Structure 1
Amino acid sequence: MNIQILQEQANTLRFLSADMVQKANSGHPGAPLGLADILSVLSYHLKHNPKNPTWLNRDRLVFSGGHASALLYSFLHLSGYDLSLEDLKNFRQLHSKTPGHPEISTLGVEIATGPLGQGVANAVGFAMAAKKAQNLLGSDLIDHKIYCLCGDGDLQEGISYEACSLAGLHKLDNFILIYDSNNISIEGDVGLAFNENVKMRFEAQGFEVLSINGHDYEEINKALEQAKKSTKPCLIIAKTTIAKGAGELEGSHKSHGAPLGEEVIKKAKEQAGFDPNISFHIPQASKIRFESAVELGDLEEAKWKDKLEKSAKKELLERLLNPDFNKIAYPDFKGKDLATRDSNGEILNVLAKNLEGFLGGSADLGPSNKTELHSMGDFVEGKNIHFGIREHAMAAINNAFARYGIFLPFSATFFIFSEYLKPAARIAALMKIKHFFIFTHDSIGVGEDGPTHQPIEQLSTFRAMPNFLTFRPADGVENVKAWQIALNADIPSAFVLSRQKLKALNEPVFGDVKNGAYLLKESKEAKFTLLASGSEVWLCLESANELEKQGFACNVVSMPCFELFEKQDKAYQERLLKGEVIGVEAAHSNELYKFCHKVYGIESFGESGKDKDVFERFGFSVSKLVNFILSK
């Protein structure tokens, strides 16, 4: 470790990154160039095995400024991960392993980033997950760091303050946040929009704060040594120059998000002692030095595996890595009238008891969402996590729990406030992680709290989001079957649950919850089919009975999951959807026109009043629905 080798290594990273952006004619060269000295020093401190990116006790590295992807990919390549030089040459191209922002399908990428702020919160989540993993498995087996690189944009986002609040509270002395402070954003000088005392901000949240020049190798190294010894979460404020090394583009906002240009790169290479006429050059000394991570990480992982072999926690780790969902005996809710928040809370408790890695919490609404895991204690010793009023950071934190390697997390709030965490839910979907979203208080049935607390459009949002099952169970039995599918699925799920008591259903007549929609009532030569979910299913059952008394044969379809129903074959859908099909939901759900001729929904915002008063006002009564169905 000396200046000449560190300079060569950092410049190798710079010019790989610049060359990648240039070949693509797209991307972000400024942050890579600004960060290249820090990452060169950090490569000496990072404990990781490039040949086994799943090693449980690896240090976790997060690039919250995911636009700096070319630098990440340069580093993964150089360090010996399964990412080739040819992969680097296909930066930002269709179907490459080097997409414009990082994706977990690229080995070595810990978590997808891009939407600013998320990475900072994910890094907090990894640090909390590491603290829990240490509680379970012991400090002999879990003792690693979590490093996050972030920029101005990350620290302006609300989610960064939310997550960092939690990091200070939980004394996350495994978390090192490195802030690239380059005074530049897309609109130019960061001073146009931000002038906080960042050191005071973070000290207020319980961090130790170090302040460095991010192009001085000795200072970077000294800060990392001191950070690694901290008794607090630590922030390193690193003053850098955007596009450092790129001559006329140094410090320019124009370097943020467009290629540097061929001539700028040539001049830059000249100044650094690189040949301007070659691209994608990796000097020998740098190549050997970066790739030493392979030998060193192999040895560290071997040492760890030896500690695991001696551990009393071997069998526990095996259960955490291989949960048996089929063994679980769920509650039997057959014939029991209940609010689905209450059925769901019972199920959460059964899962927490059966699954040592199943945990989670609510954003200050445990008692209302019914998510308390009774007698299972508070984090870190126990399983209940108190996220505070921090819906967005809760979801981004739990995204990281779901990536850590041994956890099955849930996030809970009122369905209306799903909107506060939706960007993080989207990242769960993009990554196809197993993270469960618990959303209670699902409709105008909320009643008195009024229209700011009454969901209308949120069902449409979650249904429209790809890679995300949205279950809206009509009773406890549906709620169980929903969980059984969710645990076995390869994508995340949300559970949309009532405040109010719902009536238990009779048994399926044809199909079941796994088909997304199924029949509760089936009539030969049906003139009408009433299709509903959740709280509206009994309205439909009753309306269908009135229609039958008037001489109309009816099917009734329960649809606890739209997305699953979309996947059924045509013969199945045809058997359910007979005659004139009317969909009925306390939501503004135009998507039901995919399966229904008519939709009996809610097209406005709600009203503050008693639940029965509000449902009647919005037309959810047997008399009104029957009059609609009979068109008069």
Structure 2
Amino acid sequence: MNIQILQEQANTLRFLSADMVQKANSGHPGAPLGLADILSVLSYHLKHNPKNPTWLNRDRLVFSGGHASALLYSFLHLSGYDLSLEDLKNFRQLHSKTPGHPEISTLGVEIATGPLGQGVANAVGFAMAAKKAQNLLGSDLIDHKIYCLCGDGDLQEGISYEACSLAGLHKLDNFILIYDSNNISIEGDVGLAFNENVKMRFEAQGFEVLSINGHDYEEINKALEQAKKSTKPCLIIAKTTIAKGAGELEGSHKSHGAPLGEEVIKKAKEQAGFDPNISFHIPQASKIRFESAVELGDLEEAKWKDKLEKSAKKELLERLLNPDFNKIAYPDFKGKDLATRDSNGEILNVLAKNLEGFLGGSADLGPSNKTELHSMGDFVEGKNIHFGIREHAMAAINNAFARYGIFLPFSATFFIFSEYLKPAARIAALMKIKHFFIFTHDSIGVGEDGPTHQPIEQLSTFRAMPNFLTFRPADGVENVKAWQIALNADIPSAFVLSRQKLKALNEPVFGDVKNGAYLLKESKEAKFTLLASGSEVWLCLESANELEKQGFACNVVSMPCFELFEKQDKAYQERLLKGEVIGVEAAHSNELYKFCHKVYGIESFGESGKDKDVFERFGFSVSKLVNFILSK
């Protein structure tokens, strides 16, 4: 560790980064160049095994500014991860291992980032998950750091303030946030839009705050040493110059998100002692020094495994890594009329009791969501997490819990406020993580709180999002079967649940919940099929009885999951969907015309009133539905 070697190392990172962006003719060179000194120093502090990116006690490194991806990739390559030099030359190209923003399919990447702010909240979540992991397994087995690199953009986003609020409350002294303060954003000078006292902000939220020159290697190093000893979450405010080293582009907003240009890169290389007429060059001293991470990380991981072998926590670690979902005896709700928020809360309790790594919480709505895990305690000693009124940060925190290595998290709010967390739900979907979203108060059935609290379009949003199952159970038995599927699935699930009591259904005639849609009633030479989910299934059963009394044969189909039904073969779909198919749901759900000739939904916003008065207004009654079906 001297300035000559650190300068060479930083410059290696710069020029790989600049070269990759240039070859792609696409990407972000400014942040890589401005962060290269910091990352050079940090490489001396980071505990990780490049040959085993799943080591449980590794330091977790998050780049919140995912536009800095070339710098991440350069570092992974140089440190000995499975990412090659040819992969670097395929930056931002179709099917490469080096996409424009980081994806977890690239080994070494801790969490997908790209949408600003998410990373900061993910890093708090990794810090929380580490505290819980230490609670379970001991401080002899879990003692690592969480480092996050973030920029201006991250810290302007509301989710950053939400997550840092929590980091202070929970005294996350394993969390180190490094802010790249370069005074530049896409619109130019940061002062056009931001002039907060950042130190004061973060001190108000229980952080220790350091301020340094982010191009001074000894100051970077001293700050990391102090940060690692902090008794609070720590912020390093690192004043940098965007595109540091890039001559005429230093400090320019033009360096944020376009290639530096061939002549700029030649001049930069020249000034740094690099040969300007080659690219993708890795100097020898820098090669050896970065690659030393392989030997060092193998020995760190070895020492840890020896500690594990001595631990009384081995059998627990094995259960947490290999949960057995098949053994779980769920509640039997057959014939019981219940709100599905209540069936669901009973299931959450059964899960928490069977699965040592199953935990979660609500955004201040535990009592109403029915998500309290009874007699299981509060975080950190227990399992209930009190997120406060921070839907978005909750979901991003829980995305990190799902990535940590030993946890099965749930996030809960009212379905209408799913909108506050949807960007993080999207990241779960993109990553295909096991994170469960619990959304109660699913419809106009909410009643008196009125239209700001009555979902209308949210079912469409979640159905439309890739890599997500959206379950809307009609009763407790459906609610159990939705969970069985959700825990065995390869993608995240949402549970869309009622405030109000729903009527228990009879048993399936043909198919089941695993098929997405199934038959509850089947008639020969059916003239109509009524297809419904959740709270509307009983209406459809009553309506089909009235239509049969009036002389019309009907099928009734329960559709707890649209996405699973989309995967069924034509023969199955043809057996269910006979005659003229009518979809019925208390939502604005045009996607139902994939399967239905007519859809009886809600096209407007809701109304404040008693639940029964609001459903009648919106047409949800047997007499009205039957008149619709009979076109008169």
TM-score, normalization by structure 2: 1.00
How many angstroms does 1:395 deviate by?
0.0
How many angstroms does 1:188 deviate by?
0.2
Say which SS state the counterpart of residue 74 (structure 2) adopts: helix
Q: How many residues align?
A: 632
Alignment partners' CA distance in 2, 1:291 and 1:584: 61
Alignment partners' CA distance in 1, 2:566 and 2:543: 25
| 1:528 corresponding residue in structure 2 | 528
Alignment partners' CA distance in 1, 2:328 and 2:254: 57
How many angstroms does 1:240 deviate by?
0.1
Say which SS state the counterpart of residue 325 (structure 2) adopts: coil
Say which SS state the counterpart of residue 330 (structure 2) adopts: coil
Alignment partners' CA distance in 2, 1:274 and 1:80: 23
How many angstroms does 1:291 deviate by?
0.4
Alignment partners' CA distance in 1, 2:189 and 2:320: 48
Alignment partners' CA distance in 2, 1:624 and 1:601: 12
Deviations 1:443-465 (A, max 9, x none): 00000000000000000000000
How many angstroms does 1:286 deviate by?
0.3
Alignment partners' CA distance in 2, 1:420 and 1:77: 37
Deviations 1:3-37 (A, max 9, x none): 00000000000000000000000000000000000
How many angstroms does 1:567 deviate by?
0.3
Q: How does 1:73-472 map to 2 (within 5 A)?
A: 73-472=73-472
How many angstroms does 1:596 deviate by?
0.1
How many angstroms does 1:78 deviate by?
0.1
How many angstroms does 1:228 deviate by?
0.0
How many angstroms does 1:517 deviate by?
0.2
How many angstroms does 1:108 deviate by?
0.2
Say which SS state the counterpart of residue 403 (structure 2) adopts: helix
Deviations 1:375-434 (A, max 9, x none): 000000000000000000000000000000000000000000000000000000000000
Deviations 1:322-365 (A, max 9, x none): 00000000000000000000000000000000000000000000
How many angstroms does 1:563 deviate by?
0.3
Alignment partners' CA distance in 2, 1:134 and 1:490: 27
Deviations 1:115-169 (A, max 9, x none): 0000000000000000000000000000000000000000000000000000000
Deviations 1:258-298 (A, max 9, x none): 00000000000000000000000000000000000000000
Alignment partners' CA distance in 1, 2:23 and 2:353: 53
How many angstroms does 1:510 deviate by?
0.1
Alignment partners' CA distance in 1, 2:333 and 2:398: 29
Deviations 1:525-573 (A, max 9, x none): 0000000000000000000000000000000000000000000001000
Alignment partners' CA distance in 2, 1:246 and 1:400: 35
Alignment partners' CA distance in 2, 1:279 and 1:222: 33
How many angstroms does 1:232 deviate by?
0.1
Deviations 1:454-483 (A, max 9, x none): 000000000000000000000000000000
Alignment partners' CA distance in 2, 1:13 and 1:570: 54
How many angstroms does 1:109 deviate by?
0.1
Say which SS state the counterpart of residue 88 (structure 2) adopts: helix
Alignment partners' CA distance in 1, 2:562 and 2:70: 39
Deviations 1:39-68 (A, max 9, x none): 000000000000000000000000000000
Say which SS state the counterpart of residue 251 (structure 1) adopts: coil
Say which SS state the counterpart of residue 326 (structure 2) adopts: coil
For structure 1, the residue ranges without an aligned partner over 5 or more in a row are none
How many angstroms does 1:502 deviate by?
0.1
How many angstroms does 1:223 deviate by?
0.1
Alignment partners' CA distance in 2, 1:629 and 1:13: 67
Say which SS state the counterpart of residue 277 (structure 1) adopts: coil
How many angstroms does 1:84 deviate by?
0.2
Alignment partners' CA distance in 2, 1:90 and 1:477: 50
Alignment partners' CA distance in 2, 1:58 and 1:123: 14
How many angstroms does 1:92 deviate by?
0.1
Percent identical: 100
Alignment partners' CA distance in 2, 1:574 and 1:7: 68
Say which SS state the counterpart of residue 613 (structure 2) adopts: helix
Alignment partners' CA distance in 1, 2:41 and 2:300: 19
How many angstroms does 1:213 deviate by?
0.1
Give the 4+ runs in structure 1 shifted more than 4 A.
Answer: none
Deviations 1:225-250 (A, max 9, x none): 00000000000000000000000000
Matched, 1:46 2:49: no
Say which SS state the counterpart of residue 326 (structure 1) adopts: helix
Deviations 1:576-615 (A, max 9, x none): 0000000000000000000000000000000000000000
What value does the CA root-mean-square deviation take over the aligned residues? Answer: 0.2
Alignment partners' CA distance in 2, 1:511 and 1:291: 56
Deviations 1:59-101 (A, max 9, x none): 0000000000000000000000000000000000000000000
TM-score, normalization by structure 1: 1.00
Alignment partners' CA distance in 1, 2:43 and 2:386: 35
Alignment partners' CA distance in 1, 2:329 and 2:543: 35
Alignment partners' CA distance in 1, 2:291 and 2:367: 52
Say which SS state the counterpart of residue 586 (structure 1) adopts: coil
Alignment partners' CA distance in 2, 1:555 and 1:257: 57
Alignment partners' CA distance in 2, 1:548 and 1:96: 59
Alignment partners' CA distance in 2, 1:401 and 1:213: 33
Alignment partners' CA distance in 2, 1:280 and 1:590: 51
Alignment partners' CA distance in 1, 2:567 and 2:181: 48
How many angstroms does 1:574 deviate by?
0.5
Deviations 1:468-508 (A, max 9, x none): 00000000000000000000000000000000000000000
